[PDB]
């Protein structure tokens, strides 16, 4: 789907539609008195004469301006609306307008500050007035459009309005009507003209009227600001990185264009002009209006691919020299921003985007856009990359160094994210990586060698008292010791208090929303144990059912409006088990309404179960057929009973009878962590189908389940592949998953389980997949994509298992993802950015991991005995 | 160049 | 109390769902065993983690200034984080700006910190905090006491959980009064009792007590001269520049010492510094304030014994505009010059008073601070033309008292001028006092300055054109108008404000959801009553709003409201006169029982009297349904009840409240003895027994006895200080009550109807809603009475609207009664006047239940 979240809660993920503060100056035009003015958005304003409708299609007036002349431009442009009695609308605010005008906007939709409609008549002399009276204005080329003459007056062919016309007019609002057809409208950086629609004339005369010093072979990146092109210069025939600013974009709130921070950046690097390490500018001039920068093409993959190549994730086979060349490389980076700051010069945006690393291991520093030249000042960081920004106003040349100390903490534990909300998160990793570069086999001199210099950048960096909102959370200085069940219960007691002192501070901050803190991946969702509050309710609910405790006063209010919640927004387009309906039943069946449960799940089994669309465990009927046999193996008195086995029984003659006919079966390309691009493992491909008929076969008893689980292991090896020494892990085109949602984690929890029903040759693959699942270090903390499920996967249904051993290693190897809030514990999920409470990434997920390892069984999915 | 310049934002591999 | 907020440019809303909060941050340091918890949104709390304090203590009280607030923090919590105290600070620089403000209480004034300490560690921490916040200056707290003369300030108090004081087994409860109370029978430690235990002018009375001190009543002993007297406590009197009231009075000084020649501006007598407080003497002059005064001289009614109002308001105006110039004259700038500013004298002197905004430069363009509402400029102007438009809208509230409503259209002004011609022009004033005042308003006018409407009430236009009726298209016309505003400013409520109320009303009903005055079902009501006065269909989503409001209606009861203005009793009728009827008679069936018992009120407005209202409604319409008996028997033991005491009910009498708050009203329609009359005459036209019939003519005694005259012959209720002709508290209900029940009453009490009818019609009415305005009035003359007319009723309605009427879109829309912003409702609102001439149309009134 599309996430819209945005940063701007200090210690949670909100999305932009929930973001209203608006300190900015608005933009207001006079109103005659047989005008109106209204808003329905929250970017524009329209503007409309009485009982006056337009068009539904035709040539729309698109007008741009600069940030200055802005306030003074809109009286220009209603003063002409104000005799052509045109609708015509403009943005809200200066905040709208600077994020409209800015660099990370699409293409197609910035750059317009008013847009105007006139219908077909009165566009002639709307234009010609526009033109006389827009004389000293500029404004930004408007890509999608076309300029009128010389003034900022942009054109294209588009939708006016919504339907209107008449009873509905049988169309749409984004496709146009030429010659009684339908042609869609793009909204893209060009200039469309559909084919075969009447121009006017004085319009046709306006159409009909329409070699560089390098050669761009490509295109690297594209942003408002424009593109960063990979060419090559004609006159050396040496291949560059050209970098374009088309005028007045790049607008940010300090009041500066890419227009001036591409002469601070021309400057900087003539001033740093021979720096080994340091692109040299070649070639800079204006063409057309766009001026160009030719830098020179540093050689070299990124930061984290490099750190992705080289880290020690697993062992420390092969990789026996990784911290000497990390220590190389951050010498390299001490060298050359320190040579930087004696001419002056400041980076301000160092981050693991920017340092590029060589075969040879060279480092080069890039993205000399926020450079600042004069220090004396404390400044703000503009744009920075989330964990490597200064937490405070501090001065340029600290700004630099704060980057260097945490990509001196990235090349020693990759965990950076987190210390941009927990301050003192460095060191709580700092003594992690030290245990895992003892534990691994280094020699002393090495790990001493990098530690004196990350404790000398330290010290080179403001140490600041704390004053934000996120200085209630601290870090995990202190190591816990377990020895007992008590230890055990202490843990489990802390994260049960600081889950709901994070949930009681939240909907402090959030009053009529959710109830608890979700990552972004399931923010605008309720349903489902991935990202519901629910499944959170639920995690808590058998936390306190573990230490024997009582509930936290209103637990049962919170419950019950939580779930009378769940009924009111219970819908039918979806039926997922961990983003839909199955879930939250599942979920009100263990929560203790059980005949609720199933009341509600016979009266909408049918239509829930009939419209679907996908096969797996996650959002397609697999849930449902895993919630109902749940349901009829608990509850031996269902009247839908026959039409599940039925069910059951047609998928799996479905399963049997067409191949490759559920979900991928191959390598795949997607290489992102959204849970609906992702189709393998536990939750997304045949290993849920797996799950589910090896639970059929358990309480169903019938041959074609287990040829099911032995079809599931047969199509789900096929994609698992064996590495270097003896690892097998998925491959998602580009990168391996060893996860519990995606990769090996999820196998080997149905081949543990299934072990007594399923044969030898495939129980041999749970040695190969045993050291697949053990690596050193977990990016994230969270059950489906992280350590959690890790440890799950390696620990449970093995036999022989002592809970007390098995939490010694886990609370150690929770102590990296931790901190402190009140007396309990919060964490962050699959970003590290904001604090989560939810199963899939937050602490609702570790609380269900040690509700798992105490029970024997999952509470992930059903794992009926 | 206008055109030539404006077209350099159709090339591919893009945002 | 109503804590509203004019902070949206449009309607009012609530203090409570306030968050903008520009407002820079106070912080303080949080070490690792700390915690720092925001439970209210004013105060930010600091505990050591599951360390508690006790219930009672001695609390510390820490005061600051504006400038150094934000070190006294990075002190204070350095000293509780040693001694580990449980402390509290202010949220925002903003709250420290309101909390150290002018109009706030003096229990509640100056606290910056509040530490709870132990009584163990009191001493070291007070000694600490002695030596570390030496130097540093702060506000004195009234309710506390300094320790030694740094700004820490103790109170023994309620530490945390509501107010009771317990000592030695007695419930005390603290006080924020502005003194010091120590409680009886405290174990006082050593240091606390050895700390308990270390005019040239003479006070008459006080006038006016605020955070910046008080205005006092004086006099001299030297001269014994009586004088009036300010006061400035030491940084108190903060306001958002930055200036306290000891600034404040020392700029007062000079420009009462520059201006000492000009008569009407008073002179410095005494100027000294007693203890620690300010203190400026300047002349008291005799005199009643503009509003006073023009209560007193403008014609309300008629112009008998008021022929020279226009020749006195002449010259008033020329003394206000004299002084204005020779003030300006010696660059002194008034900066707040209202109705209260301005003292007249019985032989009409004006005098100007209220110095304490005084600017003394006039080349920069400055922002009104303490702008009267109404009064203040729209713009940041040049403080003469600030001055100079205040001086034109105290011309404009002389020639037409309707000023309220010129801070949220720009132009109304100019509206309510052609108004006041037309009313002069009307009363039978002379040609040339119209002619000579007019001419110095509109020499005021353009002494001003002209601007662009910007802000976000430029979608309000005056009214400036009448519009022409002649047939009931017309009538029509203007109602198609009035529910298409009415849909425009509903929308523009939901687009800024969503899970919240659906339609925005008067500050009076802001919490309140349920029954006809000041919920949005009966807004409904009143639109679907419009749509079928058109014969027009409802436009798209009428249903779906409707349905979601009455479930939202269903889902927000409570039983502590048992009256058809404020609770279910009218939510009931409402949902009922919606279109669906037996969901009413089963939530009537479900709650009659125990709202009518549990009953506090018994008026209309609250009480019972609505209930059985809706109960005869009920059974009148639907002759068949269970508890139809317990509605007679109900009413029949409450006009026995009636029959037994007419006092034991309601106030018989003169009242005493002063004020518009319909909790403060004891008298009239909604609130007196004419709804009980009311009920019993509804009693008497479905029942039919002579009981009612006697109790209706005892409740027209009771009514008509706090009912004077005067020498005009208008029959107006006594509120003790005003006269109220409207429909909720005044006589415009009683009209109602004679000419609904007019067949049944004797020709004694129809005798009265003749003397009530002038009352009812003034030439000028303040506020436009039906209930305290001028469509009750409206409706009293024009209900009931022998054939009613629809065309030339409706004719006049439109023209007496036209006073007050909005233009929204392609539609009307109202300001309530203040005038300041736009209400919905149906006691000040649009609804209001959308039964007006649904009443007018279909006869019966329609803000009650009626039989036919
Ligand atoms: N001098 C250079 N040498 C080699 N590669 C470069 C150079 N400059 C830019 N690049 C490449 O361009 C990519 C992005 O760099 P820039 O476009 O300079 O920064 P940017 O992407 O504009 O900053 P953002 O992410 O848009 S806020 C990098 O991944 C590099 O691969
Ligand atoms: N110089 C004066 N002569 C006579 N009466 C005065 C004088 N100053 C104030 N008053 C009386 O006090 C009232 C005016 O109160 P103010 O002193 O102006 O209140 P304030 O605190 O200055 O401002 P407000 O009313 O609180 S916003 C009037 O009723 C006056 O009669
Ligand atoms: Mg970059
Ligand atoms: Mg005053």
Redesign the interface.
Known sequence: MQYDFSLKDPLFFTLTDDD??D?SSKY????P?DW?????NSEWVNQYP??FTTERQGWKVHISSDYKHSHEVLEVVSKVCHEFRVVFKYLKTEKVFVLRNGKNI??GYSGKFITCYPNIESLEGFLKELERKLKGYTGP?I?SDRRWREAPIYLRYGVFRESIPELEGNLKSDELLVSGKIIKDIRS??FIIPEGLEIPEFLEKWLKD?E?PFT?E??????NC??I?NATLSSSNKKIILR?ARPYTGLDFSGEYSTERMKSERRALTILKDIDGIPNVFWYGK????NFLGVEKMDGIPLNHWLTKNYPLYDSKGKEKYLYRAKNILKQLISIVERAHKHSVYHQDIHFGNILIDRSDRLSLIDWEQVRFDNSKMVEQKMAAPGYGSWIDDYPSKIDWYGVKQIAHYLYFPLIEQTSLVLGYDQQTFKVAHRNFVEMGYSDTDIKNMEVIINALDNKCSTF????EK??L?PCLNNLVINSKADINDFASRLGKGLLTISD?WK?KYK?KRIFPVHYYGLKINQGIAFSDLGILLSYKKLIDLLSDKVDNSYEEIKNLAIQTAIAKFRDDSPGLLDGMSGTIWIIHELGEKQLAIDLFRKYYSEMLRKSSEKNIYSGTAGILLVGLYLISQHNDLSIKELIISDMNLFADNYLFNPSDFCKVGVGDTNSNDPYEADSGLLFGHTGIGWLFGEAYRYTKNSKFLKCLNLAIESELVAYEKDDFDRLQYNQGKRLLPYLSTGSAGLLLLISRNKEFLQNSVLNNCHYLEKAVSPNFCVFPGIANGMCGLFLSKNLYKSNINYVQQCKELIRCLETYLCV???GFALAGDSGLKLTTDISTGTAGIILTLVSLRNGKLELLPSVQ | ??????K????????
């Open positions: 209203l503060t300190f207001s035009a006079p109103l008195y109106h003015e209204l808003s329905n009485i009982g699409d293409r080329y890509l950086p060009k329409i560089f761009i490509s295109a690297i990146r594209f942003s424009g593109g092109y374009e063409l057309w209006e766009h008292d704390n004053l934000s200085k209630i601290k501070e402090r009529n809030v009140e007396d | 160049m206008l055109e030539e310049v404006l350099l934002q159709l090339m591919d591999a893009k945002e």
